[PDB]
Amino acid sequence: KIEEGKLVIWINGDKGYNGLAEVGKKFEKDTGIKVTVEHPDKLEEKFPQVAATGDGPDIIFWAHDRFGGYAQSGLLAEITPDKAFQDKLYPFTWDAVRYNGKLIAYPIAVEALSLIYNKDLLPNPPKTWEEIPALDKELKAKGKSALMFNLQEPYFTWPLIAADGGYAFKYENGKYDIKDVGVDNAGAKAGLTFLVDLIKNKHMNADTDYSIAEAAFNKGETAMTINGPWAWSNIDTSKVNYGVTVLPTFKGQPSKPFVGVLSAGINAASPNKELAKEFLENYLLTDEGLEAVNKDKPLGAVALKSYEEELVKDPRIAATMENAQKGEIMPNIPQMSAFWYAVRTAVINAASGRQTVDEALKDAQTRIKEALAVQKFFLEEIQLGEELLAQGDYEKGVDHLTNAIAVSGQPQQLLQVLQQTLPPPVFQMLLTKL
Numbered sequence: 268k269i270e271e272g273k274l275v276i277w278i279n280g281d282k283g284y285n286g287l288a289e290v291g292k293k294f295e296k297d298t299g300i301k302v303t304v305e306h307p308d309k310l311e312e313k314f315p316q317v318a319a320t321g322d323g324p325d326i327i328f329w330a331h332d333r334f335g336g337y338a339q340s341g342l343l344a345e346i347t348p349d350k351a352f353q354d355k356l357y358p359f360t361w362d363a364v365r366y367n368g369k370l371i372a373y374p375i376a377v378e379a380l381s382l383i384y385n386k387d388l389l390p391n392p393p394k395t396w397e398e399i400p401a402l403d404k405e406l407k408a409k410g411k412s413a414l415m416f417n418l419q420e421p422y423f424t425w426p427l428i429a430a431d432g433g434y435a436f437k438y439e440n441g442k443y444d445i446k447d448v449g450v451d452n453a454g455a456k457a458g459l460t461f462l463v464d465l466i467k468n469k470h471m472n473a474d475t476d477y478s479i480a481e482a483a484f485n486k487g488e489t490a491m492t493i494n495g496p497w498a499w500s501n502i503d504t505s506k507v508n509y510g511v512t513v514l515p516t517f518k519g520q521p522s523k524p525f526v527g528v529l530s531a532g533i534n535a536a537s538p539n540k541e542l543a544k545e546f547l548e549n550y551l552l553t554d555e556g557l558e559a560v561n562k563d564k565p566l567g568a569v570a571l572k573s574y575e576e577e578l579v580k581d582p583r584i585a586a587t588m589e590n591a592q593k594g595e596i597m598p599n600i601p602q603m604s605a606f607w608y609a610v611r612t613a614v615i616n617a618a619s620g621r622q623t624v625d626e627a628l629k630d631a632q633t634r635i636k637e638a639l640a641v642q643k644f645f646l647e648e649i650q651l652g653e654e655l656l657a658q659g660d661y662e663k664g665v666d667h668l669t670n671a672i673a674v675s676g677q678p679q680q681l682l683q684v685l686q687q688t689l690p691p692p693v694f695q696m697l698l699t700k701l
């Protein structure tokens with residue numbers, strides 16, 4: 268069951284994973300259960316691949332938006348906290364991790380992007396995106412720049428795209444309408460057009476990523492960046508005199524960050540589920556466990572009420588909640604992964620000049636719709652095939668299964684499984700339809 272009596276933990280490399288290891292060390296000394304904290308690249312994409320074969324980590328930390336996909340694939344254990352435990356965390360944080368009637372993770376912290384600014388270069392931060400070009404020109408004559416932030420992940424560019432009306436999936440009357448995608452509307456195009464104009468007018472570079480922007484801010488070379496609470500401890504070390512504030516408006520509208528609840532899920536494949544539960548409830552989600560993580564890299568506004576009451580007068584936390592309140596909670600629905608992959612490509616293509624903004628966003632909308640149409644078709648044709656076979660209509664069953672095969676990511680493995688599931692002459696019939 269890879270493995271044994273230890274916990275492997277995956278968490279992103281921008282989080283306080285060393286502080287999480289200290290909590291793990293403590294758990295190991297009270298318990299004999301060794302804890303290993305890892306931060307693989309692209310873990311949020313790795314996990315479903317590896318968990319679907321029955322391995323990967325015992326525990327996975329990510330923002331709640333990925334977890335309904337993982338859950339709908341059966342990759343996550345149900346969590347079952349007792350009454351007392353439930354009451355210790357904020358209800359709305361539990362809502363971010365409730366999927367099809369079950370809790371599928373523990374909430375840890377509420378994350379939103381803020382504007383971070385260097386008070387020695389910009390004692391008053393801009394109110395508006397539209398003020399940035401002029402500040403940048405002024406700062407350029409002094410050998411500095413106004414703003415650098417990660418352009419390679421769409422999470423960072425979302426606040427601006429969404430400001431004037433962009434959205435992912437329409438939410439209305441208690442559900443998402445996955446047919447109603449907001450990536451390609453005029454508000455989304457205005458925001459992304461403003462971003463591309465910043466680049467064209469040399470106020471930003473299309474290839475800036477997390478590290479380039481972090482270095483430039485932490486060394487005093489750019490007056491502003493856009494980042495989450497996790498970034499604050501490196502800025503503390505750098506000695507920059509910084510503030511954390513409300514993101515600027517665009518066309519008189521607030522920037523609208525996507526809000527994430529950092530969450531800890533348990534792999535359905537783990538043979539260590541009770542131990543993971545013990546670690547999360549009795550070690551991590553306590554004032555001291557969160558403090559150990561937070562002092563390594565800040566979590567933001569935490570889901571544990573008792574620790575969060577310690578945090579509320581930190582102006583950086585006030586700015587985080589203010590931005591979060593102008594923003595929107597990410598959906599946790601399985602279709603979010605198609606959304607992010609389409610949007611990432613669009614923003615990169617537009618920023619680098621490989622596509623126009625109009626074209627980049629149209630193709631994004633198209634690619635979301637197609638990916639979801641193909642998924643629905645695969646699943647329906649699988650089901651239809653199985654239902655026909657179970658009623659004895661062998662050829663029509665096989666025909667549907669062949670439709671499923673033609674669109675599958677793994678047609679050879681599907682062929683292998685079907686050789687084991689079908690009577691040999693029904694398998695022979697299937698081979699003639701390939």
Ligand SMILES: OC[C@H]1O[C@H](O[C@H]2[C@H](O)[C@@H](O)[C@@H](O)O[C@@H]2CO)[C@H](O)[C@@H](O)[C@@H]1O
Pocket residue numbers: 279281311329330331332333378420421422423527529607
């Ligand atoms: O850029 C797409 C990406 O956005 C979010 O990932 C965030 C994550 O929520 C934060 O905790 C932090 O680590 O930064 C990430 C962005 O680089 C979504 O959660 C994720 O699913 C999505 O791919």
